[PDB]
């Protein structure tokens, strides 16, 4: 297929009209089109590179380039934001150094927290040229023609750098009449946009397919949750908050890549996009959310081996704007402290259900247990003396107590009136049971084994919406305490 | 007194409200009624001013609300919003608040012809030029001089061209728009949402709203997706409307449907999909296309979206999605008087925004196929047959006149099977008649012959702790008929869906479903 040299020669002889780019002898040629004409002489790019040709990328969209403006740093975005405000107000494209300086230098002092604003303008006045933003022709015309793009770009810059939006930002800059009601309204995707593949998302907004946690073309963080099986979404029960597992595939996860970015977002209290694919369903950007707590937990990697993993507790919010965030969220930060809450202690990989064992090492009896129940009590007492308890403190479930109930019940219903239940396991190899509190956490009940009970689907239904739910609750409360106390002597 | 009062009003204008406080609706400007009466005299009182022919007012509802009250009474009620939209465009571009009829006429009349689908645009402007006054949005200066139509609500063309009266927006409204662009963008978006939802190229300019709304028009609309409220009252405080299930319209005049989950084992969402099955309006007897249902039908015809509120069980309300009416059906259900009744089933498809460009192809295809006509499923089944009607039964029917139900299920199933382009509604909405049949067959018991055991206790709502479920999933082409369905307890259902021996069980259930079905035919 090197005969494409003949196709290139005809592109030269007749012109672009008649004939991702392909570079040959200092000239650019449409990759797909050259491949097609060569055929007569979607895996095209590979074919051309397999022949000895260097393939170059198309010029990055204005949205992408303004999105690439990231810290290694408020200088660049301040200038950019001024430039957008200028273009929207029909100011001239090119302006002299002299006016830009003493027009932006006050902004640079007040919003870019730099001392010498005059000097502050010098850096981005030059550095922004090698960011392919310094405005350009096509960019200036884009902003003058399509105000959505101006509003989007400014919203992107405002989201990442000035998420707290201090009063007098929109004017002082040129942007008050443009951003108006709400600044992040111009951001895309819209809440509820649906995509089949992860690739489809990528095509539309960029970033990469790799990783749960990553930034889209706009430079705003995005976290992706894929439901593995049915009866298992990220949502922590009795609430609308998410328990999002962290970034590292296969071994003990670290504050690198996605987890790192999450931590950077946690510290400053910046929101992020939360994507979600229900089981047998499509992806969708379903909510903005804010890091409210981070913890460490035992889980399994892709190598099926136990591992330390991060648990990012996310709180959904209507938009990035902090004024729009409900008070439960705003209370959960500041209470956060931004520090890792660790797992081990009360919590051995089994302990909990996803690691089968005999137990082959007879070190621990199944009736320890007692170790789990103790940790559950300790943790419970410590939560019980929280003056202002966040919804996370209240509803996130202690692994140790769940573990204890599992060790106690041994794949059976603990309801002594059980009509009967199957001993078949699930596809994933767990019993068809659920551990549930007799006295709901929502109504003050404690997160401890003697307040919990293992139930088959049928008995669980009885407990939850059965006609005699109340009497059953009494019975279950009794038998839970009983079963608990039987394992202490 | 009347001309005395006019002279008093004229001096209030000359000097200003501050200097009047230093020393009643007329202009489109409000005047302190006691104070105006007093200056009229010596240079209640209320009775005197109303005696002389002046409209005496309370503090008008918010501009948002009043523009939202602009509602219709192939159908021509685009006059008022066309004028209003022009006026907002004018105010944003710093034009004068009051403008002569002459200019407004031949500035708006082309807009009226192009966007208001009226023939004579020049004549089209007359109606809202006057009618908008009594909507508390407009004012016309020397009104008394005009001669009205025989009918009431149009000044005649001759009288308008003669006097050339300076008319416009109200005072405070004009200042609101001139000061706060969010309010302009909101009002315009409202009008564009209800009229012109299919936003044609390019009305934003022509109207002088391009710079304000070009990016996306509905961005200025509130509430935002995901706003959460405790009560229905909390919603009402923030956005108006009434505490009616709805449709109800909020203050902005945009339709809003509210779904409140009754117990824990249901939401509106039709299974296997994200589309909603929303029960109509009208609390108690056979529902009619009146109130909310009427509005839903108007929205269905033109393919206009609407706000869908939802409160999960033991949870809070939230505006969770925009949605579009994709199909409407008639079904048997129970009213608030606990009695069987004919009710509407509005099949909603969620969408990201009101803009049609943003809607996915499944939605577009389903709308394309709709026909907008009522599908009456009420003939296929009886209120007996629904699980919420407790009964002996008969003597109309033995319980093995289940045969009746199964027959209707077949007939419907065959008719769906021959659909060339089947919408996701056609495929996934579940036939009551077949469900009913399974319920009459199983009689409050698990049909899985290997059932480990299940309780005979009922739910709080008085239904057995079971579920009817297809052995061959509809999603995988299985038919919506009783011999393809099976009644399972929670345990057996879990076994079916994610048990380790799911596959073998499916074969067993398929077999026993056919068997049980065929036992009732002989
Ligand atoms: Zn049980
Ligand atoms: Zn069963």
Author numbering:
A (entry chain D): 8 to 26, 38 to 59, 77 to 107, 114 to 175, 206 to 560
B (entry chain C): 7 to 29, 40 to 59, 78 to 107, 111 to 430, 432 to 560
Pull text from the paper.
Superimposition of the six ScoMcrA protomers in the asymmetric unit shows that the head domain exhibits substantial positional variance with respect to the other domains, suggesting that it is rather flexibly attached to the rest of the molecule. In the HNH domain, two β-strands and an α-helix harbor the active site residues H508, N522, and H531, that are critical for its endonuclease activity. A domain sandwiched between the SBD and the HNH domain in ScoMcrA structure has an overall structure similar to classical SRA, but does not possess the NKR finger and thumb features. A comparison of ScoMcrA-SBD structures in the free and PT-DNA bound states revealed that PT-DNA binding induces a rotation of the side-chain of Y164 in the sulfur-binding cavity of ScoMcrA-SBD. In these two molecules, the hydrophobic phenyl ring of the side-chain of Y164 covers the opening of the non-polar sulfur-binding cavity.
The Type-IV restriction endonuclease (REase)ScoA3McrA (abbreviated as ScoMcrA hereafter) catalyzes multiple double strand cleavages 16–28 nucleotides (nt) away from the phosphorothioate linkage with the core sequence GPSGCC/GPSGCC. The DNA PT-dependent REase ScoMcrA distinguishes PT-DNA from normal DNA which differs only by one oxygen-to-sulfur swap, and presumably encodes a domain to specifically recognize sulfur on PT-DNA. Each ScoMcrA protomer consists of a head domain, an uncharacterized domain, a SRA-like domain, and an HNH domain.
